[PDB]
Amino acid sequence: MKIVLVLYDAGKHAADEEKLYGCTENKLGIANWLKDQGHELITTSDKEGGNSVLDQHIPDADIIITTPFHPAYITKERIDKAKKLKLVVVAGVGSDHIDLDYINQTGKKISVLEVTGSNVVSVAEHVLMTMLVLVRNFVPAHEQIINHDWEVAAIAKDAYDIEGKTIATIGAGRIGYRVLERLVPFNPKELLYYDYQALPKDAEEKVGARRVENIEELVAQADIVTINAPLHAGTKGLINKELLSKFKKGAWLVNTARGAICVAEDVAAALESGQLRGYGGDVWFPQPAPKDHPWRDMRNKYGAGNAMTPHYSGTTLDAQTRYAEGTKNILESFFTGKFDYRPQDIILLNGEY
Amino acid sequence: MKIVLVLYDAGKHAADEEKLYGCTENKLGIANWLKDQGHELITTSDKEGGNSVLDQHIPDADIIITTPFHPAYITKERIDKAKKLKLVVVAGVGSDHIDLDYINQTGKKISVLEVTGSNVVSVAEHVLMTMLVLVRNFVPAHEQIINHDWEVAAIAKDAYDIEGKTIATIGAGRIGYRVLERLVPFNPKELLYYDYQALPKDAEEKVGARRVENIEELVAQADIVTINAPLHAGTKGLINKELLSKFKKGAWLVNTARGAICVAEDVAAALESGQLRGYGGDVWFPQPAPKDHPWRDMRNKYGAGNAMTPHYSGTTLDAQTRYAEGTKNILESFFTGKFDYRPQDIILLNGEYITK
Description:
CATH class of the domain at 119-308 in chain A: Alpha Beta
Order of helices and strands of chain A: EHHEHEHEHEHHHEHEHEHEHEHEHEHE
Largest sheet of chain A: 7 strands, parallel
CATH superfamily of the domain at 119-308 in chain A: NAD(P)-binding Rossmann-like Domain
Distance between the termini of chain A: 25 Å
Oligomer: homodimer
Strand order of the largest sheet of chain A: 8-7-6-9-10-11-12
């Protein structure tokens, strides 16, 4: 079979770190395994334009492997020309870039699977780190040192302990709950959550969480808000100026789910005006963020309150090992004809939900 | 009575934030309380030199109040001239700037107290933050964004999850144990500790810690090492070229206890050579850190691995409230003649140690 694998070029960075599996130069660490079975692997990062390498091999590709960190868009046109396509794998979590609805609508026997759960711990750690960095005012603290200054009172005037604060998550799924687990020993005043379905009673009691019924009430009483909910019609532009004015004055806000859940200019305005004390996360809209994206230069009144990073929380070396191993398990189930997929990994089974 | 209060000057920042109690401008929020009680308060940051404000009022001061973040050194020479000194207070935790030995050995009747426990959570949170920052390679990640760059592979190649890592602490006291308590739900591979005495069996089971008899074996197997021990003859210069050579290759190291526990240039050389992946903390020697202190500019081979900050982990606004309240409670015990101090706050009571 012909496998096409779309990843980013890591350049010289690939050669320093051989554990960096998710690049074109290291090919998820499965290139030899695919060769041993007897299979043709096409690896490329060129995914844009009609004449791209990806489009030259789509007509006869049996399998396409993509990643959310260099996402090849599987469009209606591309699916039309994919005569032999049987399986699409996301080496990671996230299928925004796949036209799932059209595949289902045409009747083609195409399976779409992802490595469910490979990213949850990585992202949840990123949230807590981001929380601590913002609350404890770490960014200006470190900037002082490498600028060769020493002025504690400039740092301490906006520095707080995370102990004794009310922390709220919008969304209590895999990521949001594991965030709540890690906050317990820090002794928050209260842990709150809002979601479209209740946490199981036993899960709720393990973390001492309280469910709030509507979002305006949740953010009104929370010192810290973290966004851990999927992007659909209900959450698109959810964080706009009207809701932000309902936030506790001087709150902290973390978002690692999807940049489009926020209105970029409203968040920046709130940080400048003081409605927010800090904003941090690793998701942007548009993504990758242009040089002019307002979230790059936004700062609270003190020149701080920005804990932004590129989209890498889920591409740590430990997560990549899980992506590579999960992709191998998925291909194994498909090559052998067993189709013994993990149920949580199936997005579409032969064109069906 | 006369009280001398020695804090740093916060300048404009005091105006920005009324809750910034630990500066000369806001005087721990007790100035009006002391005035009503009819005492004389002296507030100064001038603490060095023989004609400083501190030395001008030492001869007849009844009480001196200090902070570790702008320490006035209660030396033998200064103790000899304090004719009326009865009480020395640490608005915070830390007594290295006080000559406790001279007081206890002479027998002068001076009580020394500190606000015990008021810094523990603040410091422990700072330790977890630094660990996640270094392990997840956050500093180069952020510098990319504010420099208007976007290159994920340059960050991802040295970024890790703290899950499944081996974490060890040198010292399992109040702060050391707190760090372990908060690490448990991050699912480390194993938690280790080294100390001159063992934790109680229950304390060990709660965090699932395993004791390691000698440091050389502790560091050799640890992905992450954090120092939470006091500075004494056994820990001064502990982290040096010899011991660092026996760390696990590519180790992360965090220190929020005392700068002198490390040899500054041995650490920098270890970081530059690849022995350490990163180093972080808020404690320095000398402190405040000179502009050319090597720890400011050191970086790992990728230009990352530095998570240093000024000495501020225990002076967050939450902690300063605890420091300010505790000082007021201590003075109230002294002024009323009750001397009903919290037992854990006493370092020396009338020049004598007490059962702990």
